[PDB]
From a paper:
Contactins (CNTNs) are neural cell adhesion molecules that encode axon-target specificity during the patterning of the vertebrate visual and olfactory systems. Because CNTNs are tethered to the plasma membrane by a glycosylphosphatidylinositol anchor, they lack an intracellular region to communicate across the membrane. Instead, they form coreceptor complexes with distinct transmembrane proteins to transmit signals inside the cell. Finally, structural analyses of five CNTN–amyloid pairs indicate that these proteins interact through a conserved interface involving the second fibronectin type III repeat of CNTNs and the copper-binding domain of amyloid proteins.
Because of the difficulty we encountered in obtaining the CNTN4–APPb crystals, we followed the strategy we employed for chicken CNTN3–APP crystals and generated a fusion protein between the FN1–FN2 region of zebrafish CNTN4 and the E1 domain of zebrafish APLP2. The structure of this chimeric protein was refined to 2.46 Å (Rwork/Rfree = 0.189/0.221). Overall, the CNTN4–APPb and CNTN4–APLP2 interfaces display many of the same features found in the cocrystals of chicken CNTN4 and APP. As is the case in previous CNTN–APP complex structures, the bulk of the interactions includes main chain–main chain hydrogen bonds between two β-strands: W751–Q753 in CNTN4 and L129–P132 in APPb or L134–P137 in APLP2. As is the case in the CNTN3–APP and CNTN4–APP interfaces, the carbonyl oxygen atom of S126 in APPb (S131 in APLP2) forms a hydrogen bond with the hydroxyl group of Y764. Furthermore, CNTN4 residues Y784 and E789 form hydrogen bonds with E141 and H139, respectively, in APPb, and with E146 and H144, respectively, in APLP2. Overall, the sum of this crystallographic work indicates that the CNTN4–APLP2 interface in zebrafish is essentially identical to the CNTN4–APPb interface in zebrafish and the CNTN4–APP interface in chicken. Finally, in APLP2, the alanine residue is replaced by a bulkier Cβ-branched valine, and the side chain of M752 appears to swing away from V133.
Residue numbers in the entry: 597 to 745, 748 to 802, 1036 to 1199
Write the structure that this text describes.
């Protein structure tokens, strides 16, 4: 006989971490039997309704208006409700707390069903099963692909949670040649583990670039010859905006679909610059950083990682910054490791010559 307690009210989230959540609550009516224990329940989009959770203390006594839930899933939206129990029974569940997501850590699972094969001429196709949302454990989720025909790994960061494929197109890929491949995941907090190395097979002259020097006709690369040639209209000199560089690319290579531009990572000595509006041109050499004309969908560069070296990548969704800035980030990130910047590439375009991240390789310095 008698009556169970009432439902508690005012479920607060006092503090929340990657696996824990501290809760406070107002005691409901006990109906004249002292409350003996409080129990907590939690609901997520992946929890099959409401489920019981563990706490520290293991049992929450009736004189406690606060406890901490443990063993929660990182990067998952949570809501909690408290139940009041006495010698008669267990009262009705409380109204849920305001939804709050647990904080993040590095992913712990590896991408499933890594595989590959097929594709078009001189391609290597790598595939995997995207990591489900509940197992991503954080924002900025992506994948790192590692493959090799050799001891150096070839690696690229693929910054898209739902990406399931990576296609390496390079003319040095032999047809139907064996490749070892492993894939791992990452997020804002760091790297996940790589999965097992498996074997896949591949499928059965110069890059478009423009260069500028104010007062002189723009130069561009001849894709076939590989030689630098002047502006075909004989009138266009340096442009004022990065979008202007993109437009000049599209004018110079009409057979291509130009979608972005980015500074080349190294300067090049270009011969035979000609002054604008000069009927006769005494050629001159100039060392400039040219702009690569990027085509089609953006694909992260593949970076060779010699076995002495290490592959890193950083991205941030809160800032969209330039190629020169990411270069300084990668370069300093490796002097702070007492190493040298070997190579680097842009991740995640967010504007014309502006990116959300960079990948880079760092090596010990070569000296006697």
């Amino acid at each position: 006989p008698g009556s169970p307690p009432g439902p508690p009210t005012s479920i607060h989230v006092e503090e929340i971490t990657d696996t824990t959540a501290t809760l406070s609550w107002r005691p409901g009516p006990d109906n004249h039997s002292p409350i003996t224990a409080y129990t907590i329940q939690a609901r997520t989009p992946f929890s099959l309704g409401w489920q019981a959770v563990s706490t520290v203390p293991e049992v929450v006594g009736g004189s406690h208006l606060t406890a901490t839930v443990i063993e929660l899933n990182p990067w998952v939206e949570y809501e909690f409700r408290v139940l009041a129990s006495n010698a008669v029974g267990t009262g009705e569940p409380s109204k849920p707390s305001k939804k709050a997501r647990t904080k993040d850590t590095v992913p712990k699972v590896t991408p499933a069903n890594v595989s590959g094969g097929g594709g078009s001429r001189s391609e290597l196709v790598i595939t995997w099963e995207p990591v489900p949302e509940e197992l991503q454990n954080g924002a900025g989720f992506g994948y790192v692909v590692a493959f090799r025909p050799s001891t150096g790994w070839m690696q690229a960061a693929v910054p898209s949670p739902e990406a399931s494929k990576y296609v390496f197109k390079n003319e040095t890929i032999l047809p139907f040649s064996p490749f070892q491949v492993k894939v791992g995941a990452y997020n804002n907090k760091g790297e996940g583990p790589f999965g097992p190395v498996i074997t896949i097979y591949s499928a059965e002259v110069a890059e478009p670039q423009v260069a500028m020097f104010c007062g002189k006709l723009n130069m561009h690369i001849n894709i076939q010859t590989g030689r630098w040639e002047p502006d075909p209209s004989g009138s266009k000199t340096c442009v004022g905006t990065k979008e202007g560089v993109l437009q000049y690319c599209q004018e110079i290579y009409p057979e291509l679909q130009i979608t972005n531009v980015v500074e080349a990572n190294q300067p090049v000595k270009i011969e035979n610059w000609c002054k604008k509006d000069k009927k006769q041109c005494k050629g001159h050499a100039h060392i400039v950083v040219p702009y690569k004309c990027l085509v089609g969908e953006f694909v992260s560069d593949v970076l060779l990682v010699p076995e002495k070296c290490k592959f890193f990548h950083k991205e941030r969704m809160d800032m969209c910054v330039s190629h020169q800035q990411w270069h300084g980030v990668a370069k300093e990130a490796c002097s702070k490791g007492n190493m040298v910047l070997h190579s680097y590439g842009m991740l995640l375009p967010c504007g014309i010559d502006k990116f959300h991240g960079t990948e880079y390789v760092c090596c010990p310095s070569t000296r006697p």
